């Protein structure tokens, strides 16, 4: 007999999604060198003097430069430091490496040496 017929027609809906990326600005700033050591041999002798610089730079110190220079302020094998930041630490170690008289910023007034110096007499 009589059967119910389809009403009209059913509709449908939907949505659409979008996205966007954005660039990130990242910059790095240059580093600042701390404290340098420099081995001065006053008379010129064996490289055992420069050996203090070698082990030191390999220990993780900034610059270790070796040259022959007449220090008129020293009269004995002397490892000099200044007390800026902690420069006393490196020369306190090297003074024992070389086996020399370790001294404060006293040669600083006498001659004015750069940073920390290791003076060896020969």
What is each CA distance from 30 to 7, 27, 33, 121, in whole angstroms? 77, 10, 10, 39
Tokens of 111: 């001659």
What is each CA distance from 40 to 24, 31, 44, 77, 80, in whole angstroms? 50, 28, 9, 10, 10
The whole-angstrom separation of Cα 38 and Cα 67 is 8
The whole-angstrom separation of Cα 12 and Cα 38 is 84
3-state secondary structure the chain: CCCCCCCCCCCCCCCCCCCCCCCCCCCCCCCCCCCCEEEEECCCCCCCCCHHHHHHHHHCCCCEEEEECCCCCCCCCEEECCCCCCHHHHHHHHHHHHCCEEECCCHHHHCCCCCEEEEECC
Tokens of 67: 């040259």
Q: What residues does each domain of the chain span?
A: 33-122
The whole-angstrom separation of Cα 66 and Cα 50 is 6
Tell me how the structure was determined: NMR
The CATH architecture of the domain made up of 33-122 is 2-Layer Sandwich (3.30)
Q: What is the CA radius of gyration of the chain?
A: 36
């Amino acid at each position: 007999g009589s059967s119910p017929n389809s009403e009209d027609d059913s509709s449908a809906i939907s949505t659409m999604t979008t996205t966007t990326a954005a660039p990130t600005s990242t910059s790095v700033k240059p580093a600042a060198p701390r404290a340098e050591v420099r081995v001065y041999n006053i008379s010129g002798t064996e490289g055992a003097a420069a050996r203090t610089a070698d082990r030191l730079k390999a220990a993780g110190f900034t610059v270790t430069d070796v040259g022959n220079l007449s220090l008129p302020d020293v009269a004995a094998t002397t490892v000099y430091y200044t007390e800026v930041e902690g420069e006393r630490a490196t020369a306190d170690a090297v003074g024992r490496t070389l086996g020399a008289a370790v001294e404060l910023r006293l040669p600083e007034l006498s001659d004015q040496p750069p940073g920390v110096i290791v003076v060896v007499t020969g």
